[PDB]
């Protein structure tokens, strides 16, 4: 049984928030994975990208921890990446799944050429950066699939991107930086100002303001 700890968690549990998009619209930090389980926890698939043993030198031996890099996301419009380090591999994977749920971002999908049907690719060329690793996503024609390395391909497929060209530069052999750079590129899709987003924003009531009475009275 989920007992919310934050105001956003209370609003989500009490069915005051009707989708993840109202939370995204106000950039509110999601600090409970149960919110993500509530909103997408019927289509989310997890995948451990890597288990990496890191070591800290000590007086009488090397202390070894394991870092789990886990990608998550329903294969439509949402993806997250989580990196968690712990002394136990199972605990690391559990923490990484929780962290990937906490970092799920909306993915903007667009059209390569003409706009028949549902969006299938990235709206424009986006670039993500992480420690000398540069990952570029380029819109591709329908039916080409993901033209990428396996590590960015996993995240692009979990993001719902049907087809996309990619370019990589740097030390992509470091899976963590590669994954974080492609996650940055994916998350920059909705932060890009395209001419279809020039329409003035019609501000609405924030969840904390539109259900302030419910929070007070519950």
């Amino acid at each position: 049984e989920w007992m919310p700890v934050t105001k956003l968690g209370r609003l989500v549990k009490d069915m005051k928030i009707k989708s993840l998009e109202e939370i995204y619209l106000f950039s509110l930090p999601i600090k409970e994975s149960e919110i993500i389980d509530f909103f997408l926890g019927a289509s989310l698939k997890d995948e451990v990208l890597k288990i990496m043993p890191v070591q800290k030198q000590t007086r009488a031996g090397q202390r070894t921890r394991f870092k789990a890099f886990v990608a998550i996301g329903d294969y439509n419009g949402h993806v997250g990446l989580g990196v968690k380090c712990s002394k136990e591999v199972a605990t690391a994977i559990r923490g990484a799944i929780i962290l990937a749920k906490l970092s799920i971002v909306p993915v903007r999908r667009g059209y390569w050429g003409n706009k028949i049907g549902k969006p299938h690719t990235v709206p424009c060329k986006v670039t993500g950066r992480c420690g000398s690793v540069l990952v570029r996503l380029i819109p591709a024609p329908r039916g080409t699939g993901i033209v990428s390395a396996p590590v960015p391909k996993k995240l692009l497929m979990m993001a719902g991107i049907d087809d996309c060209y990619t370019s990589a530069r740097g030390c992509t052999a470091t899976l963590g930086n590669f994954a974080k750079a492609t996650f940055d590129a994916i998350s920059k899709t909705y932060s890009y100002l395209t001419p279809d987003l020039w329409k003035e924003t019609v501000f609405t009531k924030s969840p904390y303001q539109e259900f302030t009475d419910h929070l007070v009275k519950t």
């Binding site: 451990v48 990208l49 043993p53 199972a90």
Partner: peptide, 26 residues
């Protein structure tokens, strides 16, 4: 299942290290 996880934590840098790390997920 957790057999690979457990045998990996016995020897993180042993002979059966890349094999088990790959067997976890690849």
């Amino acid at each position: 299942f957790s057999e690979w996880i457990d045998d990996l934590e016995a020897d993180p840098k042993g002979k059966f290290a890349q094999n088990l790390l790959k067997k976890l997920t690849g």
